[PDB]
Design a protein around this motif. Structure first.
Motif, PDB file in Angstrom:
ATOM      1  N   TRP A 112       0.821  -1.216   0.000  1.00 56.37           N
ATOM      2  CA  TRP A 112       0.000   0.000   0.000  1.00 56.37           C
ATOM      3  C   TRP A 112       0.851   1.261   0.000  1.00 56.37           C
ATOM      4  N   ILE A 113       1.882   1.309   0.849  1.00 55.00           N
ATOM      5  CA  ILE A 113       2.757   2.479   0.882  1.00 55.00           C
ATOM      6  C   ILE A 113       3.606   2.567  -0.387  1.00 55.00           C
ATOM      7  N   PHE A 114       3.824   1.442  -1.064  1.00 48.65           N
ATOM      8  CA  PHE A 114       4.368   1.426  -2.415  1.00 48.65           C
ATOM      9  C   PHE A 114       3.303   1.240  -3.491  1.00 48.65           C
ATOM     10  N   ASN A 115       2.026   1.507  -3.204  1.00 51.03           N
ATOM     11  CA  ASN A 115       1.021   1.367  -4.255  1.00 51.03           C
ATOM     12  C   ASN A 115       1.011   2.561  -5.190  1.00 51.03           C
ATOM     13  N   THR A 116       0.400   3.652  -4.757  1.00 47.51           N
ATOM     14  CA  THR A 116      -0.068   4.627  -5.722  1.00 47.51           C
ATOM     15  C   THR A 116      -0.099   5.984  -5.044  1.00 47.51           C
ATOM     16  N   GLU A 117      -0.822   6.920  -5.649  1.00 57.19           N
ATOM     17  CA  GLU A 117      -0.714   8.330  -5.323  1.00 57.19           C
ATOM     18  C   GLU A 117      -1.962   8.889  -4.660  1.00 57.19           C
ATOM     19  N   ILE A 118      -2.882   8.032  -4.212  1.00 55.17           N
ATOM     20  CA  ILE A 118      -4.040   8.512  -3.460  1.00 55.17           C
ATOM     21  C   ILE A 118      -3.587   9.132  -2.147  1.00 55.17           C
ATOM     22  N   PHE A 119      -2.660   8.462  -1.471  1.00 56.75           N
ATOM     23  CA  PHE A 119      -1.917   8.904  -0.296  1.00 56.75           C
ATOM     24  C   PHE A 119      -2.730   9.308   0.937  1.00 56.75           C
ATOM     25  N   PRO A 120      -3.481   8.416   1.588  1.00 55.53           N
ATOM     26  CA  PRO A 120      -3.706   8.582   3.025  1.00 55.53           C
ATOM     27  C   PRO A 120      -2.681   7.777   3.815  1.00 55.53           C
ATOM     28  CG  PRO A 120      -5.240   6.992   2.208  1.00 55.53           C
ATOM     29  CD  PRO A 120      -4.455   7.463   1.018  1.00 55.53           C
ATOM     30  N   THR A 121      -2.530   8.157   5.091  1.00 54.06           N
ATOM     31  CA  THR A 121      -1.718   7.457   6.091  1.00 54.06           C
ATOM     32  C   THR A 121      -0.258   7.293   5.680  1.00 54.06           C
ATOM     33  N   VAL A 122       0.484   8.392   5.551  1.00 53.33           N
ATOM     34  CA  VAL A 122       1.834   8.360   5.010  1.00 53.33           C
ATOM     35  C   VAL A 122       2.887   8.249   6.107  1.00 53.33           C
TER      36      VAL A 122
ATOM     37  N   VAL B 276      11.904  -2.496   1.880  1.00 53.42           N
ATOM     38  CA  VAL B 276      12.857  -1.417   1.678  1.00 53.42           C
ATOM     39  C   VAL B 276      13.834  -1.774   0.570  1.00 53.42           C
ATOM     40  N   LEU B 277      14.086  -3.073   0.360  1.00 56.78           N
ATOM     41  CA  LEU B 277      14.785  -3.501  -0.845  1.00 56.78           C
ATOM     42  C   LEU B 277      13.988  -3.120  -2.072  1.00 56.78           C
ATOM     43  N   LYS B 278      12.700  -3.479  -2.107  1.00 53.58           N
ATOM     44  CA  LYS B 278      11.827  -3.050  -3.197  1.00 53.58           C
ATOM     45  C   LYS B 278      11.554  -1.550  -3.150  1.00 53.58           C
ATOM     46  N   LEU B 279      11.704  -0.913  -1.983  1.00 54.49           N
ATOM     47  CA  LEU B 279      11.743   0.547  -1.991  1.00 54.49           C
ATOM     48  C   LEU B 279      12.990   1.039  -2.699  1.00 54.49           C
ATOM     49  N   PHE B 280      14.123   0.406  -2.432  1.00 57.50           N
ATOM     50  CA  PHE B 280      15.316   0.757  -3.177  1.00 57.50           C
ATOM     51  C   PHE B 280      15.260   0.219  -4.596  1.00 57.50           C
ATOM     52  N   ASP B 281      14.755  -0.998  -4.780  1.00 56.39           N
ATOM     53  CA  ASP B 281      14.681  -1.579  -6.111  1.00 56.39           C
ATOM     54  C   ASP B 281      13.601  -0.892  -6.921  1.00 56.39           C
TER      55      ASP B 281
ATOM     56  N   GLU C 131      12.787   1.646  -8.294  1.00 55.78           N
ATOM     57  CA  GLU C 131      12.432   3.043  -8.253  1.00 55.78           C
ATOM     58  C   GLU C 131      13.634   3.914  -8.571  1.00 55.78           C
ATOM     59  N   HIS C 132      14.672   3.863  -7.725  1.00 58.72           N
ATOM     60  CA  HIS C 132      15.895   4.673  -7.769  1.00 58.72           C
ATOM     61  C   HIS C 132      15.702   6.158  -8.087  1.00 58.72           C
ATOM     62  N   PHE C 133      14.505   6.684  -7.845  1.00 58.68           N
ATOM     63  CA  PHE C 133      14.105   7.989  -8.344  1.00 58.68           C
ATOM     64  C   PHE C 133      13.819   8.948  -7.202  1.00 58.68           C
ATOM     65  N   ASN C 134      12.959   8.554  -6.271  1.00 59.73           N
ATOM     66  CA  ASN C 134      12.355   9.513  -5.375  1.00 59.73           C
ATOM     67  C   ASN C 134      12.604   9.080  -3.947  1.00 59.73           C
ATOM     68  N   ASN C 135      12.460  10.047  -3.056  1.00 59.08           N
ATOM     69  CA  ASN C 135      12.633   9.837  -1.626  1.00 59.08           C
ATOM     70  C   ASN C 135      11.280   9.550  -0.984  1.00 59.08           C
ATOM     71  N   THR C 136      10.571   8.617  -1.607  1.00 58.27           N
ATOM     72  CA  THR C 136       9.290   8.176  -1.101  1.00 58.27           C
ATOM     73  C   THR C 136       9.529   7.170   0.008  1.00 58.27           C
ATOM     74  N   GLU C 137       8.428   6.740   0.637  1.00 59.32           N
ATOM     75  CA  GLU C 137       8.440   5.852   1.802  1.00 59.32           C
ATOM     76  C   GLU C 137       9.361   6.412   2.880  1.00 59.32           C
TER      77      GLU C 137
END
Length: 69
Positions: free
Chosen positions: A1-11, A40-45, A47-53
Motif C-alpha cells: 500500500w505504501i508502495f502502491n499509488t498516489e491517493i496517499f492517506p496514512t503516510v 525497503v529492498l523493493k523501496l530501493f529496487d 524506483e531509484h528515483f524519489n525519496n518516497t516511503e
C-alpha cells in the motif's frame, strides 16, 4: 500500500509502525525485519528515483538493518 499509488492517506503513520517493526528482532521474528528489508529492498529496487516511503524513515533503519544477523 505504501508502495502502491498516489491517493496517499496514512503516510507518516505507515512510516511510524515501520519504526515499531524493528523491536521484534529481539523476539526472534526473523521476517519482521526481513519483510521490512525486502520492502525497503523493493523501496530501493525498481524506483531509484524519489525519496518516497519517507526517506527519513528509509535512511535510519537501513543502517541497523545492515547490522543484523
Amino acid at each position: 500500500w505504501i508502495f502502491n499509488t498516489e491517493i496517499f492517506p496514512t503516510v507518516k503513520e505507515k512510516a511510524a509502525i515501520l519504526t515499531k517493526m524493528l523491536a521484534f528482532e529481539i523476539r526472534g521474528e526473523p521476517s519482521l525485519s526481513k519483510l521490512f528489508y525486502e520492502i525497503v529492498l523493493k523501496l530501493f529496487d525498481q524506483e531509484h528515483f524519489n525519496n518516497t516511503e519517507i526517506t527519513v524513515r528509509m535512511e535510519q533503519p537501513f543502517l541497523v538493518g545492515t547490522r543484523v544477523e
